[PDB]
Design a protein around this ligand. Sequence first.
Ligand SMILES: CC(C)=CCC/C(C)=C/CC/C(C)=C/[C@@H]1[C@@H](COP(=O)(O)OP(=O)(O)O)[C@]1(C)CC/C=C(\C)CCC=C(C)C
Ligand SMILES: [Mg+2]
Ligand SMILES: [Mg+2]
Length: 284
Amino acid sequence: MTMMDMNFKYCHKIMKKHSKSFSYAFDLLPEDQRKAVWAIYAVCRKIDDSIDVYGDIQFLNQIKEDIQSIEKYPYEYHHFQSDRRIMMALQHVAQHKNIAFQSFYNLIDTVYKDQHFTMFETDAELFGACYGVAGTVGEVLTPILSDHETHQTYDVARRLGESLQLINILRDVGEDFENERIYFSKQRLKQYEVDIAEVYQNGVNNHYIDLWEYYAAIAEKDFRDVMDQIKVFSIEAQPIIELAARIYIEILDEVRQANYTLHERVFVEKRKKAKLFHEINSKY
Ligand SMILES: CC(C)=CCC/C(C)=C/CC/C(C)=C/[C@@H]1[C@@H](COP(=O)(O)OP(=O)(O)O)[C@]1(C)CC/C=C(\C)CCC=C(C)C
Ligand SMILES: [Mg+2]
Ligand SMILES: [Mg+2]
């Protein structure tokens, strides 16, 4: 094992630890592509988790500055300020692939703004936040998972990322509420006559289920639209991306089976993930 191998192994550790669904799928990529995914993953994770390190923007600004160094000077040695192992790996990737740096900056800005989080007035705001947290990730992964990037490739990847973020929201309603976050828009909550606090205390009702299913239907339709355009991605990545998405889509059915509970995080069992892989893989 080289030093750089050690750097990617560490990124892999982070992804396996923190992202059971995405780890399962993306680890099936060919070596050079999965390694790039691990590095992108670990960067994004550090960005997402940065505020809780000291309680403020310090570690985040250090990440941003590290990324800026890489963008400006991809072939120079940097004394990274944040997590050196992750940044060395990102830099190695950047030397070989087009990285959409502005997409990382969009994600960072999204994390900065989350410090001042006020509920979304409308679904348009909510979907805007989904872009910032996850459409950006889709954009960053595009050159990794496709052979000749076009506007269509980016668009599909962005849509997928945003759909997965909406599923994430749908899984985590109760936990988010405990953390003083509600992501359903004020407009939709008012229309469906849903108070999340009241539902957290008293159990689901038909109003809440109707509202949840309204968003679920959006995530599903977007998922189907991505599946229909899967050929934008490289032949090797197609079944893997399909797997990643299907595993995440299955979370919706898990929520339903747990009666839309606001008091635990549902999950797709490993054995089910394997079932989905068999189904997809026979198709390919
Ligand atoms: C780079 C990579 C694979 C992921 C990035 C992971 C990170 C940390 C981003 C920081 C912001 C966050 C938190 C975003 C949410 C990820 C789930 O959180 P995680 O905690 O890992 O898993 P779980 O909550 O299930 O335990 C999310 C739903 C976005 C998924 C978007 C994807 C996969 C692109 C799809 C498009 C193509 C594949 C073209
Ligand atoms: Mg996680
Ligand atoms: Mg969540």
